[PDB]
Ligand binder design. Structure first.
Ligand code: CL
Length: 115
């Protein structure tokens, strides 16, 4: 029950790498990516963004064993970061953090390449 398969562990490690990333100043960038606002808190968002995505949705999908490989998980993270960069202006913190976390994501995948 509690022992993950290698693929489950890899998925978890990728997810945790993005979640736990702290920069050189101690700032945990993922805090604002965990959960989107509701449709009634920010309707404009859901009019603008075709496929809403946040880390909780990612985590839920992973916990359900719905990701069959790492690339499928990466695709959802990419969607999330691209949505943040579509809704928000390039000057904004959310846009900038999405770029940093995208780099964390890809470096992590590359680092785990051989497992
Ligand atoms: Cl980095």
């Amino acid at each position: 029950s509690k022992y993950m398969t290698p693929m489950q562990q890899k998925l978890n490690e990728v997810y945790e790498a993005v979640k736990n990333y702290t920069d050189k100043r101690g700032r945990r960038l993922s805090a604002i990516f965990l959960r989107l606002p509701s449709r009634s808190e920010l309707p404009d968002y859901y009019l603008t963004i075709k496929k809403p995505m946040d880390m909780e949705k990612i985590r839920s999908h992973m916990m359900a064993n719905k990701y069959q490989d790492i690339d499928s998980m990466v695709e959802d993270f990419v969607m999330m970061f691209n949505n943040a960069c579509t809704y928000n202006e390039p000057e904004s913190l959310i846009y900038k953090d999405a770029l940093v976390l995208h780099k964390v994501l890809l470096e992590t995948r590359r680092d785990l390449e051989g497992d």
